[PDB]
Amino acid sequence: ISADQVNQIIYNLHHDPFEILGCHLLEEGKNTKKWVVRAYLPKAEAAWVIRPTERKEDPMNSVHHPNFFECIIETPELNHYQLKVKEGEHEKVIYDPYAFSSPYLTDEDIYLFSEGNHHRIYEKLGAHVGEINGVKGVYFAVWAPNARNVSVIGDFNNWDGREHQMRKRNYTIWELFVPEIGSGTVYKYEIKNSEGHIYEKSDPYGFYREVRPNTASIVVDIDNIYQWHDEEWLEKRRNSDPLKQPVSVYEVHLGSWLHGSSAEKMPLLNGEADPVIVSEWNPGARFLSYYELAEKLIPYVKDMGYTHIELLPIAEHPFDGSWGYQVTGFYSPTSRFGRPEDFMYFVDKCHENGIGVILDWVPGHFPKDSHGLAYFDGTHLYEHADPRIGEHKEWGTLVFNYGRHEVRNFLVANVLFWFDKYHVDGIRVAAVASMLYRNYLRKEGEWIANEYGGDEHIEAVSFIREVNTLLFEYFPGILSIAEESTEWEKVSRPVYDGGLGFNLKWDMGWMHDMLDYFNIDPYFRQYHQNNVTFSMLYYYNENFMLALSHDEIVHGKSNMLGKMPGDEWQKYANVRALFTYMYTHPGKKTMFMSMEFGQWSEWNVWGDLEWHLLQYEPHQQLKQFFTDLNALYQQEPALYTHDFEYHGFEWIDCNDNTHSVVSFLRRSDDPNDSLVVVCNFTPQPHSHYRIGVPEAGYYVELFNSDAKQYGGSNMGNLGGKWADEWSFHNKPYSLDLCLPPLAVLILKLDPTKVP
């Protein structure tokens, strides 16, 4: 490029920057092509083009002006890239703002979509505000290859689409530009199938929707509604390994954390909306907006000291009682809580407070609701036609055809969509078994094996591996968390080693062992010491997340206090002992709303949590317990730097089944950060209980779950204990400890204490 062309850009004299900026073909070789990417990046000193799917990074060179950058790349196709921009000490990674000249589908878009490789198809499919033939309007496009006809109906044509019949491109996608209409436009697709049957559909790629039980899609100017402030958070995440840092997740169902009064409007960011009544049964109650939740949920979580909030599915879903797991609008955050920008505000505010956001994502199935993806164009389009692989008959739902390119693309681009437009920090997928197995909840003779005569769902395994590959390439440093309940191997291992590509797996065995153990009368725990210790035997096969989730405090299982035996005092002690053990055991941490203040009742999705309990000392003390334990967890490297290395854990002794006592070390990089954990899982206090420690010195009582401020009896070691030179548990030195009842101690050598 020439200096005059550059100067025309710098000084805003150029007639169309898209001629010069973005990705331009220079020449074709035999096997390859020469491309140039150009960017105008004012205030940037340096820049790179990332080809994340190819594992490649090329520097950009300043050309004629310090803020005008060129990068020449030889590669057959350059569809998938990001710009890295350095402004002083700070780096951001972005999509090229000059990637798309035109709002309409190109030959290239349609080709990539057909191969299932359009990682940004949601820029072109759906509804987009744009300019065609010199007029501002909205481009609509939808995949419906077998439709006889498709029309856009909406507010703008009184739901009569005779003048808004769409144009079929390449026998696969319907499009229409509509002039003068913009964001706020309420619309659906009217489809005639091959039999002449006419019916209405929500926009599969729709970015916003009316409030359930209404189903109309709404046009969003998704790139011009919110100003982000989280560049520093995103830089930090991209440049960190979340496996080497503290992850304590507060799991939340947004619709049932806290309700407001339905007698006022729902405040939004710089706006308001009609209240959304939580139900006909509880009509005085409304949901909080994403905006109110940003003002109330985020400081609450910040004060508790959790690192992450995990949301039950917020993709648009018709029925409250699905909890979100039955999705019909994969590309919009539910309108129950306001608008897309309100949710953007919520993620931005989490990032300002140093809190990450994980989404429950549901690529496994979708329900039969006629507004949604089911039998979309008069064929099994999104779902496989054979019900032996295309229905979960026990659930009444449909299974995506993962082998069909445009379906794979729908889902793969969907997971990227939440990281791109909503800046989320991870996903969790429930019931991965449901996807992995051809015989899942199917009886003999009602399923067919794969082409090798196995039960493995080959197309699903392949899909899951592509999701995790692309996710970590485009957004390094995220969390991809799986719950898989059948002992499938290498769930949280890289795809190159034959894994599924998650970086964490819920330890469901650990959950079952812990809740079965603490449910047992203390006298009888001696028959069940294996519940405490067994899960360290398979621990190193995956990167485990220790999750006590929503699923464990519904459907007659009781909330945590209700699972515990004894009087009120012992029930609380049991909770403190379990959670202190969970926070000191190797693995990341997940717990669900209500567990942190001792809600007695089960989680009820039709109401909000029992906040009135925090009027009373016992609930308050348990919340202070969790607050201090989260604080300890972020402050003690040995609790998080080596969760997944042998170095990080060693049993001291775990053979005293008779007294239900176990003890272990946690270690980190610095030997002086080592922690001695001692667990007493009966109400029998011990005056003198010897534990081997690795070195002489004073061992501080860093934490004691029986402290009086947690609702305990306040027994312990009055600040700490000097190690005797007294061989015990194959260790040179030992502590003569007081063990409080139904309690866990954490002790740390203070190597600079005065003898």
Q: Which residues bind Mg ion (CB under 5 A)?
A: 607-608
Q: Helix axis angle, 290-304 relative to 617-635, nearest 10°? A: 80
**What is the CB-side half-sphere exposure of residue 175 using CA atoms within 13 A?**
17
Cβ closest to Mg ion, residue 552 vs residue 608: 608
Smallest separation, CB 259 to Mg ion (Å) = 6
Closest CA to 545 of 583, 506, 511: 506
Smallest separation, CB 608 to Mg ion (Å) = 4
Q: Are 365 and 399 in contact (CB under 8 A)?
A: yes
Cβ closest to Mg ion, residue 123 vs residue 608: 608
> The tokens of 3 are what?
């200096």
Cβ closest to Mg ion, residue 22 vs residue 607: 607
Q: Which residues contact 20 (CB under 8 A, 6 or more apart)?
A: 1, 5, 9, 14, 38
Closest CA to 544 of 481, 489, 627: 481
Closest CA to 220 of 6, 16, 417: 417
Q: Taking the CA atoms of 153, 159, 163 and 165 in sequence, report the sign of the dihedral they define.
A: positive
Question: What is residue 184's three-state secondary structure?
Answer: coil
Q: Which residues contact 295 (CB under 8 A, 6 or more apart)?
A: none
Cβ closest to Mg ion, residue 562 vs residue 607: 607
Cβ closest to Mg ion, residue 611 vs residue 689: 611
Backbone angles phi, psi at 92, to 5 degrees: -125, 150
Cβ-based burial of 682 (10 A; exposed 0-12, middle 13-18, buried ≥19): buried
Cβ closest to Mg ion, residue 608 vs residue 701: 608
Cβ closest to Mg ion, residue 607 vs residue 685: 607
Closest CA to 410 of 331, 487, 485, 349: 331
How many Å apart are CA 299 and CA 247, to the nearest integer? 18
Q: What is the DSSP string of 77-127?
A: ---S-EEEEEETTEEEEE--TTS-S-SSPPHHHHHHHHHT--TTGGGTSEE
Q: Are 467 and 411 in contact (CB under 8 A)?
A: yes
Smallest separation, CB 590 to Mg ion (Å) = 24
* Pairing label, strands 426-429, 504-506: unpaired
Cβ closest to Mg ion, residue 278 vs residue 707: 278
Cβ closest to Mg ion, residue 608 vs residue 636: 608
Smallest separation, CB 415 to Mg ion (Å) = 34
Smallest separation, CB 633 to Mg ion (Å) = 30
Smallest separation, CB 258 to Mg ion (Å) = 8
Cβ closest to Mg ion, residue 130 vs residue 607: 607
Cβ-based burial of 270 (10 A; exposed 0-12, middle 13-18, buried ≥19): exposed
> The tokens of 146 are what?
């077998």
Q: Which residues contact 95 (CB under 8 A, 6 or more apart)?
A: 82, 83, 120, 420
Cβ closest to Mg ion, residue 157 vs residue 570: 157
Cβ closest to Mg ion, residue 604 vs residue 655: 604
Smallest separation, CB 285 to Mg ion (Å) = 7
Q: Are 95 and 420 in contact (CB under 8 A)?
A: yes
Smallest separation, CB 610 to Mg ion (Å) = 7
Smallest separation, CB 531 to Mg ion (Å) = 35
Smallest separation, CB 600 to Mg ion (Å) = 14
Q: Name the residue with the smallest CB distance to Mg ion.
A: 608
Smallest separation, CB 607 to Mg ion (Å) = 5
Smallest separation, CB 622 to Mg ion (Å) = 20
Tokens 């405040």 belong to 267
